[PDB]
Design a protein around this ligand. Structure first.
Ligand SMILES: NC(=O)C1=CN([C@@H]2O[C@H](COP(=O)(O)OP(=O)(O)OC[C@H]3O[C@@H](n4cnc5c(N)ncnc54)[C@H](OP(=O)(O)O)[C@@H]3O)[C@@H](O)[C@H]2O)C=CC1
Ligand SMILES: CC(C)(C)c1ccc(Sc2cccc3nc(N)nc(N)c23)cc1
Length: 192
């Protein structure tokens, strides 16, 4: 596949855009996990699937029995990897672009994490869309976090919900979802 449009999908706590603590999300938002699954899995073209790209540490963090993520082509990046097709669901690669050369019959491509991948790939011009779940909490500071997004958002535009709706198709988008003390909303951003 040549120069596909890629999207980053991430969940971050405002205002600092904290994303994790010692390799894990500092929250358990059950509806947000469901949205992540639907968005990354759904396709509109017939014999296609979507691809998910992740860093080797994220891959390793998923319990062996739960990988690869079903119904999507999983791509794992490592600087030590050779560009190789493991099976029909798993690709190893050392760069995003090299990995995309090995795919066909893919509709959308999503970067799913983790912290290092996000922070490095936000600056690759293949990235055209950000799907950011903006999480809010009454006392952000009480949540322990060690990793943060370092995104240049001054170079990006938050679109209206109609545009997000158009992006996700059939997926139901509820507003101000509450789970425990967290409130969140789904957003779409594109480059200026
Ligand atoms: O903290 C920990 C979690 O770390 P976190 O940052 O979330 O993990 P990530 O899921 O982001 O994995 C980071 C790993 O992904 C690989 N990688 C990162 N950036 C690139 C790149 N630009 N090109 C190719 N491979 C890349 C490297 O694998 P490798 O170390 O195998 O090079 C790196 O160690 C626990
Ligand atoms: C390293 C950290 C812990 C930030 C990390 C965070 C998330 C993910 S994948 C993921 C899992 C569950 C829900 C998710 N929600 C959205 N919106 N984005 C993701 N990428 C998600 C993989 C790695």
């Amino acid at each position: 596949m040549l120069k596909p449009n890629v999207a980053i999908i991430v969940a971050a706590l405002k205002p600092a855009l904290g994303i994790g603590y010692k390799g894990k999300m500092p929250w358990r938002l059950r509806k947000e996990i469901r949205y992540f699954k639907d968005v990354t899995t759904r396709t509109t073209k017939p014999n296609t699937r979507n691809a998910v790209i992740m860093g080797r540490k994220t891959w390793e963090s998923i319990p062996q029995k739960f990988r690869p993520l079903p119904d999507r082509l999983n791509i794992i990046l490592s600087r030590s990897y050779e560009n190789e097709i493991i099976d029909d669901n798993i690709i190893h690669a050392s760069s995003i672009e090299s990995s995309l050369n090995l795919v066909s019959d893919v509709e959308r491509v999503f970067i799913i994490g983790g912290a290092e991948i996000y922070n490095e790939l936000i600056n690759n011009s293949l990235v055209s869309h950000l799907l950011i779940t903006e999480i809010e909490h009454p006392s952000p500071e009480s949540i322990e976090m060690d990793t943060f997004l370092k995104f240049p958002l001054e170079s990006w535009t938050k679109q209206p919900k109609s545009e997000l709706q158009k992006f996700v198709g059939d997926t139901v988008l509820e507003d101000d979802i509450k789970e425990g003390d967290f409130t969140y909303n789904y957003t779409l951003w594109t480059r200026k």
